[PDB]
Subunit: 364 residues, 4 copies
């Protein structure tokens, strides 16, 4: 019933009120400057971009979500087969459960069966690095789905409020991670889980050789909220404490700036409450290399394959519309299109010593 | 039934909820400084100003709206005959439909019949320049109403979400436009359609010899909203994507600043959600040479001639009041009266590198 | 029935919704810094201050309001006899009506009968200076109540929307005013009427020898609103235009700054929506020499003598509390106590080039 | 029935609507930067800190509240015995009543009986120093509970609106306080009472040798509100005046900055509307040495011992969570962890000349 937590996560995320609960992406404060004369035609817009060694159709990825059981695997199947069809990369949920129990291995292995060509991304938790995971468990997760990269997740917020949570993040784990990167065939992405990557955390990770980040800021799926609900449900007293932390974290937009600024040469996924292609566009324009999505993908896949195919169409169209309307012929042009940064995001950046002049240069 | 789109545009704009829907002019953030001692009498205020080669009574124009059918032409008739009476210039709707079908030619030609002296402004769409329009179609549109100028419209936003939309804006079209200006007897205005002119777009247009701009920013008629409604109505899936773009664009006030700043010597109409003579006053004060109106004129003309005559009286009075209360004896004095720029418009201008010092100089 | 407008003004102001209607003082944005150790006792706080040649008990005045009829004069009687008792100066309403009709002379003359010692301030409208008033009409108004000063009022906003309004403010009127000051035995105050004095207006007035100003900014009695109501009532079409100007003007707080800054050595009444002793305190602290009130005094006087005596007690106490809690032993100490300027007032001051450094110096 | 005021204070504070009534801590504007990789384990977080000569378990204190009667003493008993159990320091309510009546001495003396080891802090009012309290009354208060320090309270705000209030704060009282510190065996803390310490007040107190401050800013228990309620209840006319001052004071967060900045080397309690361990965390991070609480401790103690034990667990956990999620191994690390200062708090600090650069340095 670490597999029970797995179904509870999906069940709450999908059907309960946790999307952006008391949180904010700050994407509100980002405005793409409209170009009344785009200088391009809609049909010649090229959404292709690179994702490590492969090429992907759209600068969007599905980030890690689930696995560890049947109904969980058949979700992963729906996601993967559609992701394949659209040429967009897919992460899988934490593979811990598949390392601990061989029955859960199938619900992850299905992904590569049904999606042979797209980038697939493994997933293990940072806490497990403190609790005696090493080179072989990583290679396990990797070869189990023939992953093109592995995502190690940061979730100290969640672990703290989780009823069975493991809030251990000793510096030792980074020495280990860095050694494991020596021996690994594929690159590592470090990703948060709804609470965002600060420039301190980015710089630290970078100092240990981490080059790929996934922001996962607040404003999307509220993981403190999900554990709060699990806490309420067990009459665990932590529930009320969690309530005080519902807006803890770096908002996604702020995280994107923070990471891009503190480690310019990084490969950067901008995720955490990306809900439309416009949001994807803003995130990329703001500094991300690719935009990441979880929850809305889950909600669609639960409704069935074509429901999700319609979702990706809507996202892709939206993105292309933002590109069109900024005169951005391809992903590179979008990355350097004109933006306005307003309100709280501005105040944030200024206080954190993010120089708006030198920032415009770093993003391009 | 490109004529059907023409009636549907009028029918939605006039009777459905699209005026400023999730959009904003930012005119809110503009404050005309009250002068307790004006230094003038109300009766000596002179609202006269030049409009290319003619002189107009008020620094206000009715911008292009409709034509292509009977009930559409009898609207144009009401507008034009009232515009004439008040000595205010009038643009007509897109003349594409009249180029394609000779029956629609009457609904445009009526305008010059009933309004012999005021500036009348022709209208063709930018996409048509990529789709084989040229010198002769322009001269057609012009001589068809004995136009004093022709407005070429930017509507990539609209075209994108339009169900039958043509979102093609290749750079070629500007090379063509620039050549057509060589041969044309009247000047060209480039205008947007509810989404605004950025300083990048202004500068580009200017580099092709365009000197007359009509901002048409967001915060008035929401053209994305109108197409969304047409999409909902056809059960076209684009409807929901459109919903995400309802606040896409440059707000009018911001656009005025952007144009005036990036191309100081421009002749500049400030339009997009101008609803009162106070709005007109702000737009002029802010940097516009003349203020532009569409939707409220439509709504009045639909109610009848005198309903619209009362409207122009209200607008004029309001304008004169703002002039009086700023001690502005004439349109020139208004253009350099004292203002305050606040809130989001300030943040916008700062981020976009609009120097408030050097701006005050350019508008004065 | 210029006497009828007099009754209607009181009747609307007193019983209808016009106090701060869509307007704002910006006093919100002014904060008096609390001193946990004041350094004084409440009982030793000295509220005394000078008012031209006289001394007054409190740095507060009742500004001009009414007269011209019986029920209007018996209001002036209640106000005056209470003002006398409290040693606070009182302005009277416009004396135009008393110049035009000798029956109205009594409703003004009563004031000096019942208030022999306090400063009484005469009142005439600026428009009348263009319409043939001069030295003798001024001396009339003065000697009619043995005034210690005369207030000439600026009301171009009001006159514009007034149904029988006279919006004439030629520069000639200042040449005349300046000559009339030559021959007058008492000083002149120029005051606005709900719409505030800008720094341009202040400077202009100053260049004609005017040294005493009464801000009367927006956020209090909305005089555009009052005339709008009169308009609605006569089915006058101006009603709707007025509605668009409901928030026209300089907010009181801004006006105080603007005047103090542009003419440092001025004697300055801060009025326009002063509703509590805290408001009075903020206004003085901000830069006013004395605080001015109209509407709330009217409303109390209408309820009877003791109702108004209780009002002045409440005001005085409130003021003293603010003085106590800022460690301000007397009016001078309050004028230089510590403040915070926030929000929109700050943005206003910055845009209008009011240097916050050099401002803090000027207000001391 | 100065003991009646004691019962009324508790009875209103506890059961009526006065917590943060029209007031604000500004803690909203303080954001602790989330660290996705903390670099520590939750279990190795050390919350210990020094409190004068003693060491305390948590950087939190219960600030002074009550005493003077039986049901008041049995509250003090519950608080103290729990405070003891958790190793957190406790202040007692004003000991005036125990100096005046020997029956009230028991309700204070109980505290040291049931809490032998924790720091206990005496309490006397600043007004009593002008009304002939001296060395011996201080030593009385101290030895009556074997206090480790004495808090003298600033409450001019309260005294002003109190029906039986004594608003006397002559400078003389500081000369006296300073002399009394000569002869006293324990240190003196100066604390406010819901209205905050300004940098002027801090500097003044410091110039008289005061080194320990307790901010007690607005946004928590509204003492003006409490006296307002007492006023309403006695039909005292001051009630309405009080209403106008409900948001008078320095917001806690602002006060913390102001004190830390004006007197860097101070020992500083940050109190006034601290309601969660997150609030405690923010206050310490911001500049406080320890966080202070009153009202929520009262409310729990009223419900019984274990209700309050649960409360302290909740607070401690919350605090440790904030520490964890900022990678703060101990109280010192938290004091120098990364923050963002936004909105009104930023505007406040800027206007008050608090240099954000030189501030970041002072807080570490
Ligand atoms: C049901 C669900 C389970 C998830 N589980 C995982 C996990 O196993 N590992 C992980 O790194 N991310 C996990 N995520 C977090 C996402 O990858 C993502 O970083 C975060 O939810 C923010 O994106 P969103 O707001 O678009 O969902 C999960 C999200 C959802 C909705
Ligand atoms: C019913 C209607 C039809 C319009 N059609 C056209 C068009 O043919 N060509 C064009 O350049 N502008 C067109 N406009 C846009 C206006 O000229 C104007 O730029 C825009 O609506 C913003 O102004 P408003 O908010 O005052 O309406 C149309 C507006 C309306 C309301
Ligand atoms: C009923 C009434 C009549 C007034 N008439 C006059 C007038 O005769 N002359 C004048 O200078 N001010 C006049 N005032 C304006 C006030 O002196 C004051 O400047 C303005 O009302 C703002 O103050 P308040 O908001 O505290 O009323 C009048 C105000 C009221 C309420
Ligand atoms: C019932 C009650 C009585 C209090 N009485 C005292 C007092 O005797 N002396 C004092 O210095 N502080 C007194 N306080 C004020 C607190 O010590 C504290 O400074 C203030 O309430 C702000 O903290 P809070 O918002 O956490 O309650 C009292 C607070 C409460 C709730
Ligand atoms: C958002 C996120 C990281 C979800 C997985 O949490 P978990 O603690 O259930 O993962 P694991 O199975 O690694 O404990
Ligand atoms: C606001 C605006 C430009 C309306 C005309 O759009 P359209 O696409 O119907 O014009 P055309 O007839 O040129 O296609
Ligand atoms: C607020 C104010 C100035 C009221 C008097 O206006 P008015 O135009 O009735 O005065 P007058 O009697 O001078 O015309
Ligand atoms: C918040 C606070 C200081 C409460 C005690 O006030 P009080 O005036 O009842 O105290 P004392 O007993 O010293 O008069
Ligand atoms: Mg886990
Ligand atoms: Mg078109
Ligand atoms: Mg008049
Ligand atoms: Mg007391």
């Amino acid at each position: 019933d670490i597999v029970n937590r797995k179904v509870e996560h999906v069940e709450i995320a999908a059907f309960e009120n946790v999307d952006g609960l008391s949180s904010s992406t700050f994407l509100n404060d980002v405005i793409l400057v409209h170009q009344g004369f785009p200088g391009i035609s809609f049909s010649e817009i090229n959404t292709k971009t690179k994702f490590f060694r492969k090429e992907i159709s759209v600068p969007v990825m599905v980030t890690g979500m689930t696995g560890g059981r049947n109904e969980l695997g058949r979700i992963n199947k729906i996601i993967a087969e559609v992701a394949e069809k659209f040429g967009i990369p897919m992460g899988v949920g934490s593979q811990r459960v598949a390392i601990e129990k061989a029955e859960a291995r199938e619900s992850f292995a299905i992904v590569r069966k049904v999606a042979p060509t797209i980038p697939i991304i493994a997933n293990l938790g940072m806490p497990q690095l403190v609790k005696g995971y090493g080179l072989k468990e990583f290679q396990d997760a990797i070869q189990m789905i023939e992953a093109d990269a592995i995502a190690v997740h940061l979730n100290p917020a969640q672990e703290v409020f989780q009823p069975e949570g493991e809030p251990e993040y000793q510096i030792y784990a980074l020495e280990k991670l860095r050694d494991i990167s020596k021996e690994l065939s594929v690159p590592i992405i470090v990703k948060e889980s709804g609470n965002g990557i600060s420039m301190e955390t980015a710089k630290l990770l970078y100092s240990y050789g981490i080059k790929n980040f996934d922001t996962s800021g607040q404003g999307g799926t509220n993981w403190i909220a999900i554990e709060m609900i699990r806490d309420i449900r067990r009459g665990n007293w932590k529930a009320e404490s969690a309530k005080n932390f519902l807006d803890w974290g770096v908002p996604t937009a702020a995280s994107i700036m923070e990471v891009r600024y503190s480690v310019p040469d990084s490969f950067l996924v901008g995720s955490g409450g990306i809900r439309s292609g416009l949001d994807a566009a803003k995130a990329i324009a703001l500094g991300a290399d690719i935009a990441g999505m979880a929850l809305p993908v889950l909600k669609s896949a639960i409704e069935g394959k074509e429901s999700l195919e319609q979702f990706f169409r809507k996202i892709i169209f939206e993105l292309k519309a933002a590109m069109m309307l900024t005169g951005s012929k391809d992903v590179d042009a979008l990355k350097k299109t004109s933006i306005v940064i307003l309100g709280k995001l501005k105040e944030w950046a200024e206080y954190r010593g993010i120089n708006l002049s030198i920032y415009e240069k770093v993003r391009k």
